[PDB]
Amino acid sequence: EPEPQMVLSPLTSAAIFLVVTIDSGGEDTVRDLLSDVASLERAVGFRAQPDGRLSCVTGIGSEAWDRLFSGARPAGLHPFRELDGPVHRAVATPGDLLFHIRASRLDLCFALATEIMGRLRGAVTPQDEVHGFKYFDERDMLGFVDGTENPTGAAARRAVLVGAEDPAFAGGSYAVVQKYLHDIDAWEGLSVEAQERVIGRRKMTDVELSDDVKPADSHVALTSVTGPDGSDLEILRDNMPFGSVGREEFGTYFIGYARTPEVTETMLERMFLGTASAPHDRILDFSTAVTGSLFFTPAADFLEDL
Amino acid sequence: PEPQMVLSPLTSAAIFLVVTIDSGGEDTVRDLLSDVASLERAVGFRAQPDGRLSCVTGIGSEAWDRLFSGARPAGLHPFRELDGPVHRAVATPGDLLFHIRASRLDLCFALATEIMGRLRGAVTPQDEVHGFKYFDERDMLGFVDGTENPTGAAARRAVLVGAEDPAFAGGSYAVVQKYLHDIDAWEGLSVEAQERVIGRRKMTDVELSDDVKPADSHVALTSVTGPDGSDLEILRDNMPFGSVGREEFGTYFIGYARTPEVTETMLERMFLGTASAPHDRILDFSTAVTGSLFFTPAADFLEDL
Amino acid sequence: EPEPQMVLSPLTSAAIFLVVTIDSGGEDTVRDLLSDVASLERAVGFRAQPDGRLSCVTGIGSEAWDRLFSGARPAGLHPFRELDGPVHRAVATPGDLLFHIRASRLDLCFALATEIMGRLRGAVTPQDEVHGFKYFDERDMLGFVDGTENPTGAAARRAVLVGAEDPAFAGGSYAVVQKYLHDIDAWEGLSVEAQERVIGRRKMTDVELSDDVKPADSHVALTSVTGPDGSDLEILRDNMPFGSVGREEFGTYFIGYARTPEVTETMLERMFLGTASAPHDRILDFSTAVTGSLFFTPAADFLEDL
Amino acid sequence: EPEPQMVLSPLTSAAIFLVVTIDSGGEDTVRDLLSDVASLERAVGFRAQPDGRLSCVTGIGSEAWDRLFSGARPAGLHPFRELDGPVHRAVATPGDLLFHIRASRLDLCFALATEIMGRLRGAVTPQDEVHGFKYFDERDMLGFVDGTENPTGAAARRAVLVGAEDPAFAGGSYAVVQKYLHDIDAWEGLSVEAQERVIGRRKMTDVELSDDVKPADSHVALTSVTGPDGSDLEILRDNMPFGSVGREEFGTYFIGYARTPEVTETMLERMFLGTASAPHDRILDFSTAVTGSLFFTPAADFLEDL
Amino acid sequence: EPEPQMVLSPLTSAAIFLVVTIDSGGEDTVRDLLSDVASLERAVGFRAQPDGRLSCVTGIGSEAWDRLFSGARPAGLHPFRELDGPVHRAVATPGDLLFHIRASRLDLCFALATEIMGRLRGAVTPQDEVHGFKYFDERDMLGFVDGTENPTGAAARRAVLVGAEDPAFAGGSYAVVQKYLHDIDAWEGLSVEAQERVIGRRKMTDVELSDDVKPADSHVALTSVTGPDGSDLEILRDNMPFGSVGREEFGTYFIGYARTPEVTETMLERMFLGTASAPHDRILDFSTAVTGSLFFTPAADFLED
Amino acid sequence: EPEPQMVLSPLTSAAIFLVVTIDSGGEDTVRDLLSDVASLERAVGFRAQPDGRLSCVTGIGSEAWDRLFSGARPAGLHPFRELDGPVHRAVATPGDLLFHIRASRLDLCFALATEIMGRLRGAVTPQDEVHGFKYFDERDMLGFVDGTENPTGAAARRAVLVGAEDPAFAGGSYAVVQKYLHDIDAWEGLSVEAQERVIGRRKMTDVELSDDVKPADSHVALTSVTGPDGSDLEILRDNMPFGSVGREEFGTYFIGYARTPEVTETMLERMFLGTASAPHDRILDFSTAVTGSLFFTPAADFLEDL
Ligand code: HEM
Ligand code: HEM
Ligand code: HEM
Ligand code: HEM
């Protein structure tokens, strides 16, 4: 049977990330909205077809889940696990609801955000609002190509969607968000050769540096994990730059979907806390996490039925 | 004598950047103005011909006197505060304006980054607004915005300084105002009422006929005719912006004209009223929180320092 | 599955509706054309790909079915039922074949229509020919967004395609057509608030009116029907405006596909005859039906092989 | 230079030609519409920028000019001159006003036509209404590329716009329209080689046949006219196919702009009456003119001031 | 189980065909490249999305297969069979690897070909390099629409991909290539009506000639085969024109994918050797084959190891 | 004005450069072709509008000019000047005619080249044929953005077109071509910082290096010349990469247009021979010229009239 949310969206060039908390007594207003969210996507999005590609993914946090539903909980659902590393600190910030809104135009995102928060004023409190845009040729603020090794098609369905291991909630996924702020001054002080040492790929051509040469504290080194299974462990990311030139804010908004947060959380450990042969991900010497939240993004039919 | 890209094509994205010049920044600023033309190309060229990146640089009255000596543009002065019976148009600080436009936001942002990069230390940001086209050229009130702007030769004649101030021919006078709307209240009106506020039909964007159109409608108060009986026109490129988190919904107003007298007449009519109208009804749902006037020189004036 | 005809087309912006009757002796010429119709679709369409999105769906009436084939009939196939209501009359007009031709450009529709009518010169008599065009924001002639609540993906497959319940004809569907003409003068006499009360959605933003404000005689009210389960019964529509400014004709050409006509026919009863709560669909006070025909659109396999 | 109407439109893929006559007493209503016509173009067309390319060219006939205006007449303006040839007849049909409406989508045309006829209902009577569409590679109904040898840029400005030779009306132009209906059955009976002989260019590649192979009764031969000047005389054409497959109507709607009708009228004489070396244009053996009108399309400034 | 290579690519307008042989001792350098070829496709292609539509399909010859791997062989894999017909000769030329590289722009093909040949310098020897371009309305060098009756969606999956009949290599396909050169002078000597008799469809409208009037020596006649069960036998083609104006070379590069080569090879026998009804395909009277090679294009997983 | 050839073309992604010499007795066949070349451009190109952007610019060498025409010669027309530098050599190769064919798709270039070489079979001998392609972000074979500082609009008119100084040939221009091959192995051996020192701009962001830090042997340094007039001397370039991976050929085809060749030739002297402060342009340490030819590209009117 079950239809999931538009987690596997195509490439989109605009996004709004909205994270909010439920005030006391808001729970009823929110449950009403969750049943209608699908129909607002269509109201706003239908008229702009087919260029629009407007998609909203709604996610719910661990404490918010217990306030909203009783019954079963998704297996992997918990608050974000703060990581207090030797050097770098992955923080945990409040967040009950996520709207990850994507389209080919910002206005569509904004229109949907308007209608959603319109129904929710009274009942929630905004914690974070980010307007994200694609930079050139799928590049991020650091000037590297961002998204290349994401899984596609069949391999994406397999790495992202809950299946038979938690059959109650098949079609759902686990999203982790974290807002990063970069130290561009520092970063642009590096030679390109040295930047490529940090990331693990070539800047201009976006080719992976060979085993012969790729540092073990490079980002691509530390985020490549193999299972016990011997097969690679993959997640799906849709990192979006944001910023303001006035307030020297240059950002990467990280969002990572996985069929189980164990995967996402492992990559994070390796980045913040280190391996045997690496102190921490070099990327963090130019990037500070200022948020961190985890959510479960149910199947679409789950929300329909409220 | 070639002008700045004041007559840009339709673009879907913009950054408005307004700064003041710190004491001793005058030198760093003069350097940037000479190079601004060439940064436009650097950033923009590789995205052609979709890109449509354009930057227009404008200079305030007080800043002009700090940066150059010699003759001044005839019309250049600080934005005039309007203390109306009900509505007040404020004046906010602003030495430099960058009006950056393109078909993608990232192009605007990359140019804004490179400009503010050369000015970090010399200036202090007063205002930064990221604007976007809503839908089918609608604004935050739901009406089509731009329809009666002049085009081609009529725009050339309405926006560019000519023989009347020959020293500065190719320049223009930009007025900016950030407006915030009380959407709460606006969506409280029927559509028929909203049309009476604006002066056009919402969905079809046809003018209301002169026999039904109120004298306090926005379109009424912003149609001015001269002594010679011909229309007095400006060029606008209003951009919506906002934040749903802080229930901020806005229209960023920018209006270019060959003399500020024109732009300023429309404003007086809006804030202070006519015989037959207390004030523009659009202000009962829109608050001005900025106001600055700039002169946007011919391009050769900037190149040559 | 069997491969079905292109009933699930994307959004296309142009269409030709061609309805014909079969003359005496034309049976043979028609059978030949049905076998080749698939391959004419490709001839005409292939060189314009993928911008083109040319699709033709062919359907066959009740009486024509018996002239053309022997063997089983589709379970639901019958003449359109005239509905003689208190006020409004849904009429039944003759039609043996339907060609529902759709593309992103009118000329492609016209080239294929030319080739089809070219092979049927002698054999048939045209009853109806409409050239339709989508308004630029998916609006119809009344000014409302038209198609918003159509099913997509798996839900559409389930709503429109014959399955196991008549396994002989799996992949087929049941198309109902009606040409409507509108009294625009009257319609533009209403406030927008009133027009929204007729339709049941907001004009500009295309959001459903809330359950507590939506009239029982609104179009959206009378066309939402619930099944045995209490789950919604859906059809797939691709209404197209048409008209002529010279002869003050402004129209909406209605076409609805469903896996069984009982569904489409229920919606019609509710619209024309009324419920306890509602005299008739208020949309009919501004729209007159001047045609009405029912067709079965077979699986594509069924045409290929005879 | 004074501002002209949008005669020099880019390539556009849709059009509506509307021809009407002014009933008596209607002259006031028509003067009103002419002043506002410019601003209706923008009302409808603004919101669709920049894809829209909506443009309306308004033209006025000889008799209607005298009923409508104040003072002096455009030099070249007169009723269309019937041409009673040995074989073929170029007929003259009634027509006081022309709206030549063009865009990249048919709906935009229709919207503007609606708004225009809205202001005129009562005051005029429709004579002819054609909905035209380009084939996908600039082909006409005969299957040949159509538009190739039109002038561009400076050469077009010079060959179309009235200048100092009639300085009251500089910026205007002279349009000739004629609706043609083709005999497709006949035409498709020819070999391609023979079709090429009729037109004077190659069907597939659209290359001009070499000087010693191109018949003198070919269309391209008879419509190439040299001045006293020794230089070529040029017009600007935007021929649009139209038709109905039901009613076996296949058409080409001819519209031709020139700075003086002398040029257009010369091509017509050559076509219908013959030269020294040719009876008549072979294309007319497959094409019947069923209308014919001439109009003057003033400068835009002229219309604004009424 | 398996993800296949991008054999079912969308319509693309540019291609590079690259055919090489493996030098002695190159086996190792080649094996490394095959494991990484997937990830080079993404490197080069990702930043061009979604316009780019860059795809590479890699295939391996019969003799090369035995050099590179031990273990099972694909059931159908063998050297291209020469066909010495009464009149026309289908030749067999050397070729160990195939890269069938496709995109919307030529430069993307070229950047990937650069990266591939970069890792293979020293290990291989180029046999053939062709830069192809589709004409703007899907026509080929003879002026006819080329691709029309290719299978799509599920029917293509069924016609092209190895399934349960050799489950070891499911997801694979069999590619046959032939470079053809045309005698354009001769071809353009025909009336269109005659050309249609060679091909079996209408030139301009691309409609099949009716069964009664279509010659049995037309190209479409000889390449329609039915199986024993009476359902039609299909392949997937992506013919690309190429040439050089300077050296009067005008060509069609033929590539055909099928779930077994028996199918492709049958069509060839009919073309070169004839049926009862037909001496040979008339298209060969204007087209000469100057290459001929057969490859197995494995499932993508098989390369990743 | 007179109309010039399409020297000021928009951005195009594909090109064919064809250079030929005229055989004994070819002069007549060539004169015929030149009169028709404008009209072949339109034949081939018109049906592909507006995406096509097909343009062909035809140029004629010094010795060829005297075979083909008598009467005046263009002031600046002469054989390409060999420059035998201390280190690097700018060579002269033969060329009577140049066809500089540009469009958005290669096939359009090829179709026009085919039609042209078709009419010249027998009469000419090909000296060079190059199929060029722009990389997707306007980069060239060295990885840098190429075209940035080319003049546009009115400043280009002023830099490229012969005017009043040789009024007989106003509308013409002077094209110089050179085929370059690069030693990519060597080039990719540099750090990016070093490559930027060769070119004079930033690789990634395409920003000029500041006057304080830009080497005097950088390419941008040596090719900025100022006139007697005090203002900069500009040319118009449309460099195109080409190559073959089989024969390890990676190339840049150089073409430069100017209103007089003295401008183009000065830049070349500076590149190959050096200044006081520079031995030679560093770009030549990675690029070898293997052709060199100079042509005059006449006004379009000049060709039409033969
Ligand atoms: C500042 C935050 C980040 C930035 C700017 C960033 C940027 C990038 C870049 C440039 C790449 C290389 C291109 C690609 O393969 O997509 C990459 C790869 C990757 N990133 Fe990140 N990243 C960030 C954070 C994260 C985080 C927090 C995670 C995981 C929790 C993550 C997981 C991955 C993975 C798995 C890969 C691919 C591994 C493979 O080569 O097989 N990234 N990221
Ligand atoms: C406060 C937010 C504003 C909004 C949302 C707004 C919106 C609009 C709209 C919808 C129109 C009709 C469509 C069009 O002609 O563009 C319009 C017309 C106009 N507006 Fe505004 N406007 C604003 C502020 C201003 C200001 C401050 C000025 C001048 C100082 C101005 C000057 C004009 C002019 C000159 C016209 C056209 C008059 C004509 O139709 O002949 N607007 N505006
Ligand atoms: C049924 C009506 C017509 C059809 C189907 C038609 C079709 C064509 C075609 C295929 C061409 C060649 C391609 C081109 O240059 O556009 C052409 C050229 C032309 N037609 Fe027509 N045409 C028609 C009527 C007319 C009429 C009524 C006129 C003038 C009164 C006209 C004037 C021309 C001119 C001037 C040319 C090009 C001259 C040159 O090649 O230098 N056509 N027409
Ligand atoms: C050999 C291969 C060549 C390559 C790869 C090449 C590449 C470039 C690049 C990357 C730029 C900087 C961006 C730009 O402004 O376009 C440039 C600028 C330029 N090149 Fe070249 N070029 C080559 C040969 C030549 C030759 C032979 C000439 C002149 C004969 C020339 C004249 C210029 C000029 C005049 C400029 C810009 C001057 C200014 O910045 O004010 N180039 N070229």
mmCIF file of C-alpha atoms and ligand atoms in Angstrom, chain B residues 139 141 143-148 177 179 181 198 200 218-219 222-223 234 236 238 251 253 263 266-267 270 282 286, ligand 2:
data_model
loop_
_atom_site.group_PDB
_atom_site.id
_atom_site.type_symbol
_atom_site.label_atom_id
_atom_site.label_comp_id
_atom_site.label_asym_id
_atom_site.label_seq_id
_atom_site.Cartn_x
_atom_site.Cartn_y
_atom_site.Cartn_z
ATOM 1 C CA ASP B 139 2.878 41.963 -4.739
ATOM 2 C CA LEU B 141 -1.384 42.616 -1.390
ATOM 3 C CA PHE B 143 -2.367 42.722 -7.111
ATOM 4 C CA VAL B 144 -0.285 42.822 -10.262
ATOM 5 C CA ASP B 145 2.546 45.315 -9.693
ATOM 6 C CA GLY B 146 4.372 47.083 -12.519
ATOM 7 C CA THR B 147 1.670 47.203 -15.232
ATOM 8 C CA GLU B 148 1.633 50.951 -16.049
ATOM 9 C CA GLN B 177 11.069 53.093 0.962
ATOM 10 C CA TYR B 179 6.919 49.222 3.479
ATOM 11 C CA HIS B 181 1.767 45.585 5.377
ATOM 12 C CA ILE B 198 -5.934 50.160 -5.492
ATOM 13 C CA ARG B 200 -7.664 48.209 -10.648
ATOM 14 C CA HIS B 218 -3.712 54.524 -5.137
ATOM 15 C CA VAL B 219 -3.893 54.739 -8.944
ATOM 16 C CA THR B 222 -0.329 58.597 -8.363
ATOM 17 C CA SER B 223 -1.558 59.763 -11.808
ATOM 18 C CA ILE B 234 8.395 57.196 -12.938
ATOM 19 C CA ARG B 236 9.192 51.339 -10.325
ATOM 20 C CA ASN B 238 8.671 46.985 -6.374
ATOM 21 C CA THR B 251 6.832 45.601 -0.411
ATOM 22 C CA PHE B 253 9.537 50.400 -3.099
ATOM 23 C CA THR B 263 8.517 61.186 -7.313
ATOM 24 C CA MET B 266 3.313 61.576 -5.897
ATOM 25 C CA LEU B 267 4.417 61.173 -2.282
ATOM 26 C CA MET B 270 -0.180 60.030 -0.996
ATOM 27 C CA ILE B 282 -3.038 52.017 0.462
ATOM 28 C CA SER B 286 1.169 49.881 4.612
HETATM 29 C C1 HEM G 2 3.111 50.648 -0.578
HETATM 30 C C2 HEM G 2 3.272 49.672 -1.455
HETATM 31 C C3 HEM G 2 2.984 49.922 -2.867
HETATM 32 C C4 HEM G 2 2.300 49.012 -3.565
HETATM 33 C C5 HEM G 2 1.940 47.647 -3.052
HETATM 34 C C6 HEM G 2 2.036 49.558 -4.820
HETATM 35 C C7 HEM G 2 1.319 48.826 -5.766
HETATM 36 C C8 HEM G 2 0.896 49.340 -6.943
HETATM 37 C C9 HEM G 2 0.012 48.717 -7.853
HETATM 38 C C10 HEM G 2 -0.631 47.369 -7.755
HETATM 39 C C11 HEM G 2 -0.196 49.557 -8.916
HETATM 40 C C12 HEM G 2 -1.122 49.253 -10.129
HETATM 41 C C13 HEM G 2 -0.351 48.293 -11.062
HETATM 42 C C14 HEM G 2 0.738 49.207 -11.638
HETATM 43 O O1 HEM G 2 0.354 50.168 -12.398
HETATM 44 O O2 HEM G 2 1.943 49.084 -11.286
HETATM 45 C C15 HEM G 2 0.610 50.697 -8.636
HETATM 46 C C16 HEM G 2 0.654 51.774 -9.482
HETATM 47 C C17 HEM G 2 1.460 52.872 -9.260
HETATM 48 N N1 HEM G 2 2.193 53.093 -8.132
HETATM 49 FE FE1 HEM G 2 2.371 52.019 -6.532
HETATM 50 N N2 HEM G 2 2.561 50.769 -4.886
HETATM 51 C C18 HEM G 2 3.142 51.106 -3.731
HETATM 52 C C19 HEM G 2 3.792 52.306 -3.393
HETATM 53 C C20 HEM G 2 4.009 53.348 -4.286
HETATM 54 C C21 HEM G 2 4.705 54.565 -4.093
HETATM 55 C C22 HEM G 2 5.387 55.027 -2.846
HETATM 56 C C23 HEM G 2 4.648 55.267 -5.292
HETATM 57 C C24 HEM G 2 5.175 56.585 -5.723
HETATM 58 C C25 HEM G 2 5.806 57.425 -4.956
HETATM 59 C C26 HEM G 2 3.912 54.459 -6.221
HETATM 60 C C27 HEM G 2 3.665 54.836 -7.549
HETATM 61 C C28 HEM G 2 2.827 54.208 -8.419
HETATM 62 C C29 HEM G 2 2.525 54.739 -9.746
HETATM 63 C C30 HEM G 2 3.120 56.009 -10.327
HETATM 64 C C31 HEM G 2 1.608 53.913 -10.310
HETATM 65 C C32 HEM G 2 0.929 53.945 -11.713
HETATM 66 C C33 HEM G 2 -0.116 55.069 -12.129
HETATM 67 C C34 HEM G 2 -0.985 54.819 -13.439
HETATM 68 O O3 HEM G 2 -1.684 53.734 -13.492
HETATM 69 O O4 HEM G 2 -1.053 55.647 -14.447
HETATM 70 N N3 HEM G 2 3.573 53.318 -5.572
HETATM 71 N N4 HEM G 2 1.253 50.572 -7.388
#
